[PDB]
């Protein structure tokens, strides 16, 4: 068991809140865009607190995270470009970074190739996956992957 803060970054409209809601699953909470769940992975439980807020919290945001998930939409070149900008922001401030290509189901609107997503992880030195929140594809696998990468830090 452990607890980690996972921060969701990316342009508006790429599906950050959708991915977080699927992670949260099916009022007294101070603050609103923070999602908590304990996941069982490789027979072991781990809690992630997934932050979806992308000011003291705005300044601290890129320094507090145990892991960062930078999301873009495969149907929007602009969002992919600004993904690259976000890694550099993170640099300017030893932490897992996942580059996520969301909206994989829009396979006919594809503006960003799989190869382009892969190259970008290579250039960022980080992990890569494509998901769809509307088909519920690779979402569980995204967050389970984050847990595994975090556990490689500790060991
Ligand atoms: N087709 C498709 N639409 C998605 C996907 N993820 C999110 N959306 C849609 O894109 C819009 C923006 O989603 P939202 O989660 O608010 O994006 P956010 O600004 O990054 O939080 C919503 O209308 C979603 O239904 C996806 O994987 N596939
Ligand atoms: Cl889009
Ligand atoms: Mg949102």
UniProtKB/Swiss-Prot annotation:
Belongs to the small GTPase superfamily. RGK family. Most highly expressed in the endothelial lining of the blood vessels in uterus and heart. Lower levels found in spleen, lymph node, kidney and testis. Also found in cells with secretory function such as the islets of Langerhans, lobule/duct epithelium in the breast, bile duct epithelium in the liver, surface epithelium in the endometrial glands of the uterus, colon mucosa and acinar cells in the pancreas and the prostate. GTP binds at residues 10-17, 102-105. GO terms for cellular component: I band; plasma membrane; T-tubule. The keyword rRNA processing does not apply. Changing residue 17 to N: No endothelial cell sprouting. In vitro, interacts with calmodulin in a calcium-dependent manner. Promotes endothelial cell sprouting and actin cytoskeletal reorganization. May be involved in angiogenesis. May function in Ca(2+) signaling. The chain holds residues 79 to 248 of 298 of the full protein. GO terms for biological process: negative regulation of calcium ion transmembrane transport via high voltage-gated calcium channel; regulation of skeletal muscle contraction by calcium ion signaling. Disulfide bonds: none annotated. Keywords: Calmodulin-binding, GTP-binding, Nucleotide-binding, Phosphoprotein. The gene is REM1. One of its GO terms (molecular function) is GTP binding. This is GTP-binding protein REM 1.
């Amino acid at each position: 068991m452990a607890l980690y803060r996972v921060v969701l970054l990316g342009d508006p409209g790429v599906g950050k809140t959708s991915l977080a809601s699927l992670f949260a699953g099916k009022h007294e909470q101070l603050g609103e865009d923070v999602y908590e769940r304990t996941l069982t992975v490789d027979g072991e439980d781990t809690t992630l607190v997934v932050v979806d807020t992308w000011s003291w919290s705005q300044e601290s945001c890129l320094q507090g995270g145990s892991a960062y998930v930078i999301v873009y939409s495969i149907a929007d070149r602009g969002s992919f470009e600004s993904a690259s900008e976000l890694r550099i922001q993170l640099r300017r401030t030893h932490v897992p970074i996942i580059l996520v290509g969301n909206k994989a189901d829009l396979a006919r609107c594809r503006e960003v190739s799989v190869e382009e997503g892969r190259a970008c992880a290579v250039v960022f030195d980080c992990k890569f996956i494509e998901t769809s929140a509307t088909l519920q594809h690779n979402v569980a696998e995204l967050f389970e992957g984050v847990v595994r990468q975090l556990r490689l830090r500790r060991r």
